[PDB]
């Protein structure tokens, strides 16, 4: 007989064998996250150990099916995944030490704290204390201390472990014929065996470099405006041509600039949009929010929520001795069981988060028919992009006005649109350079082209070169600032956010052109449009069965990523910023420093 039939029956058995043990483990994780107890932890650990043992015995068995003989890509993709040896190639001692290091770093991150040097009895924590400080505080020395103490106390402990972590990761990567761990991470975009759609891991860097060049113009004007604002907000501290202090970015790391809206609002006298008061007056609840959200997806022709969705999901904080992890997440347990966990409360941000989670659930339900190994998004950022386009479409004044929240007496004007675009830009445009620089530094470090005696130096160099931010206090090799971030310490990627930010605008433009929208793009609304819904569903059903390039070509008619939609979207703000910056300086000096004078 042939090997193809053997592999097919093997995969058919594996799917059914793995579905059940998953259902058990998935149910266990849900029961644990819903009620923290000692027995649930042990049960979840047992289920995870059983699942890992099952994956171990299922692997090392498909090696009898060489890939060079298979011809149907449907089975070839399923087989290529199981053949991955993973960390099993390393020795027992090395794997044990790596797991111990990971757990120790996670514990250090989750248990860090700070205390006042002049008052050791006074101590604070990151989540309740430092976030609120960096958000609402306005003093200079206070923010400087909050920025310096946490780092000096936490990062200096993770420095030695990170080197061994990098060494072990590079060894594991080279064991599996990869050039390094960065090449392994970039494997999610690799595509072969299809003429006209091939994609290499190296071409991604070229594409990112080519795309980043077009964003510098708008970022320069935004930085100029923010600097002009800060010079009036904090005189005698901000330089007219120097870089902005890191501790003044509203957060500990400088990822989002949303906190600067109150200081950068051009027309502070105009009425800002906040329907929280109307929602409180009408006495809405979580069920109302979720039903209004479901109606949005029903208006475009998508399926309704399942019956068990409302019975099993948790949409309210118990507010009792029971403790739960309040963090919006979408759970897919299989067998048609979909649930959401969220400590929902009356607020517009919660409305947008509910829309995002329902968008995620729709995607999860779309590809439920594909084989187990293929029930996943074709790309990392597609889920987040699909979730964010819905929030964008819903956040329009027209949508809120159609549901009776905003009174018809409200009149639109240039200032309102300018403020809306500025608020959107402060959130979206601010994270791209930071993400790019962080990912590039991480790749260059994993590549081994930066000896240990230059890590922190090149960090600040690339910072001042790209983002144009200068540190308020000089640091040496004893400090480890990159390790003071969640994703960096928890071994997570970053490029997914960049890809999602690039794809969401293309998706929005395509869906709005499908609905025959007119006028500016930021006023588009896809409600009551079935053509766009069908066009999107035609792609949501593919899943992991086809390359992302073909799906993107079917959706927007293009293969590679493009930035023109974002520029067309932000054209009004880009044009308005020039009238203000005409009398301001452009660029930033890389020599000035707060402690240089």
């Amino acid at each position: 007989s042939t090997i193809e039939e053997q592999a097919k029956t093997f995969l058919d058995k594996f799917n059914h064998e793995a579905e059940d043990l998953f259902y058990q483990s998935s149910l266990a994780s849900w029961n644990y996250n819903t009620n923290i107890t000692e027995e649930n932890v042990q049960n979840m650990n047992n289920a995870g150990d059983k699942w890992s043992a099952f994956l171990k015995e299922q692997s090392t068995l498909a090696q009898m099916y060489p890939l060079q003989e298979i011809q149907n890509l449907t089975v070839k993709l399923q087989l290529q995944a199981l053949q991955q040896n993973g960390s099993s190639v390393l020795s027992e001692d090395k794997s044990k030490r790596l797991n111990t290091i990971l757990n120790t770093m996670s514990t250090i991150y989750s248990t860090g704290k700070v205390c006042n040097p002049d008052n050791p009895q006074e101590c604070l924590l990151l989540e309740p204390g430092l976030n609120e400080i960096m958000a609402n505080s306005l003093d200079y020395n206070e923010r400087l201390w909050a920025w310096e103490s946490w780092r000096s106390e936490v990062g200096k402990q993770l420095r030695p472990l990170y080197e061994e972590y990098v060494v072990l990761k590079n060894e594991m990567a080279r064991a599996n014929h990869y050039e390094d761990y960065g090449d392994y991470w970039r494997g999610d975009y690799e595509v072969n065996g299809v003429d006209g759609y091939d994609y290499s891991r190296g071409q991604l860097i070229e594409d990112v470099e080519h795309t980043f060049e077009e964003i510098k113009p708008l970022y320069e004007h935004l930085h100029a405006y923010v600097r002009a604002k800060l010079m009036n907000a904090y005189p005698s501290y901000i330089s007219p041509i120097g870089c902005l202090p890191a501790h003044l970015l509203g957060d500990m790391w400088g990822r989002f600039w949303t906190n600067l809206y109150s200081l950068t609002v051009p027309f502070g006298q105009k009425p800002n949009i906040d329907v929280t008061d109307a929602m409180v007056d009408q006495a809405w609840d979580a069920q109302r929010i979720f039903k209004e959200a479901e109606k949005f997806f029903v208006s475009v022709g998508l399926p309704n929520m399942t019956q068990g969705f409302w019975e099993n999901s948790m949409l309210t904080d118990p507010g009792n001795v029971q403790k739960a992890v309040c963090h919006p997440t979408a759970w897919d347990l299989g067998k048609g069981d979909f649930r959401i966990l969220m400590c929902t409360k009356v607020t517009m941000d919660d409305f947008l988060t509910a829309h995002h989670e329902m968008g995620h659930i729709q995607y999860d339900m779309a590809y439920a028919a594909q084989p187990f190994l293929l029930r996943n998004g074709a790309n990392e950022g597609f889920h987040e992009a699909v979730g964010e386009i819905m929030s964008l479409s819903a956040a329009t004044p027209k949508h809120l006005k159609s549901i009776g929240l905003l009174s018809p007496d409200f009149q639109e004007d240039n200032e309102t649109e300018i403020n809306f675009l500025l608020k959107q830009a402060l959130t979206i445009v601010g994270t791209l350079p930071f993400t790019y620089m962080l990912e590039k530094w991480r790749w260059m470090v994993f590549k081994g082209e930066i000896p240990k005696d230059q890590w922190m130096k090149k960090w600040w160099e690339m910072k001042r070169e790209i983002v144009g931010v200068v540190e308020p206090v000089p640091h040496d090799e004893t400090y480890c600032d990159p390790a003071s971030l969640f994703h960096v310490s928890n071994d997570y990627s970053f490029i997914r956010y960049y890809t999602r930010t690039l794809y969401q605008f293309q998706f929005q433009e395509a869906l709005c052109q499908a609905a025959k929208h007119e006028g500016p793009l930021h006023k588009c609304d896809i409600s009551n449009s079935t053509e766009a819904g069908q066009k999107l569903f035609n792609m949501l059903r593919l899943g992991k069965s086809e390359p992302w390039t073909l799906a993107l070509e079917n959706v927007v008619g293009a293969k590679n990523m493009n930035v023109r939609p974002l520029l067309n979207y932000f054209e009004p703000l880009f044009t308005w910023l020039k009238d203000q910056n005409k009398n301001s300086f452009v660029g930033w000096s890389t020599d000035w420093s707060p402690y240089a004078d």
Binding site: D12, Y23, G308
Partner: protein, 195 residues
């Protein structure tokens, strides 16, 4: 008047797993279909080649009743000209058929926490089954060109379990199906409708 034992097969606890679907012969009794609403009014009533109205004034010699449990998604495979694992290896109807199919939901009855592994089904076989055929073989299936010497590579057990739970989606919940076949032969009729 003498009624049929319909109330038995519709009220039993066990329901004749598909891989060993049971068959019962009904003869010499009056068929009263109004009792079906006692068990479940909500039904998936559907017939082929005959209507439930003209069925009340006809006569037949013997009536065969088949029963088994399957998922909700596989209910579409129980019909002429269909394909699939169930239709090809467990139970196959002929291209020409005259009867009715009945289905109702039995989640809270058969479903149980920790999984109900008492039901089994077949998924591997060398050839397809003929119309109205039954097979209870338990020998291991050979996928490769090597002789069988116990479970192992290319040797798989031809039976598997469902494992129903009460927290399953409607597509995976258990469904009890009953098939009624009407037969006519050169002998005195024994089954007819009321007056």
């Amino acid at each position: 008047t003498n009624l049929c034992p319909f109330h038995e097969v519709f009220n039993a606890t066990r329901f004749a797993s598909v891989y060993a679907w049971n068959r019962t012969r009904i003869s010499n009794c009056v068929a009263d279909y109004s009792v079906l609403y006692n068990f479940a009014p909500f039904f998936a009533f559907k017939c082929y080649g005959v209507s439930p109205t003209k069925l009340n004034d006809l006569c037949f010699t013997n009536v065969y009743a088949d029963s088994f449990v399957i998922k909700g998604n596989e209910v579409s495979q129980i019909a002429p000209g269909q394909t699939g694992n169930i239709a090809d290896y467990n139970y196959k109807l002929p291209d020409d058929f005259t009867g009715c199919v009945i289905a109702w939901n039995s989640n809270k009855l058969d479903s149980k926490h920790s999984g109900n592994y008492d039901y089994w089904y077949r998924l591997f076989r060398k050839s397809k089954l003929k119309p109205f055929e039954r097979d209870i073989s338990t020998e291991i299936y050979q996928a490769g060109n090597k002789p069988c010497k116990g479970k192992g590579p290319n040797c798989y057990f031809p039976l598997q379990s469902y494992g129903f739970r009460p927290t399953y989606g409607v597509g995976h919940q258990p469904y009890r199906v009953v098939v009624l076949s009407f037969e006519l032969l050169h002998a005195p009729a024994t089954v007819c409708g009321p007056k």
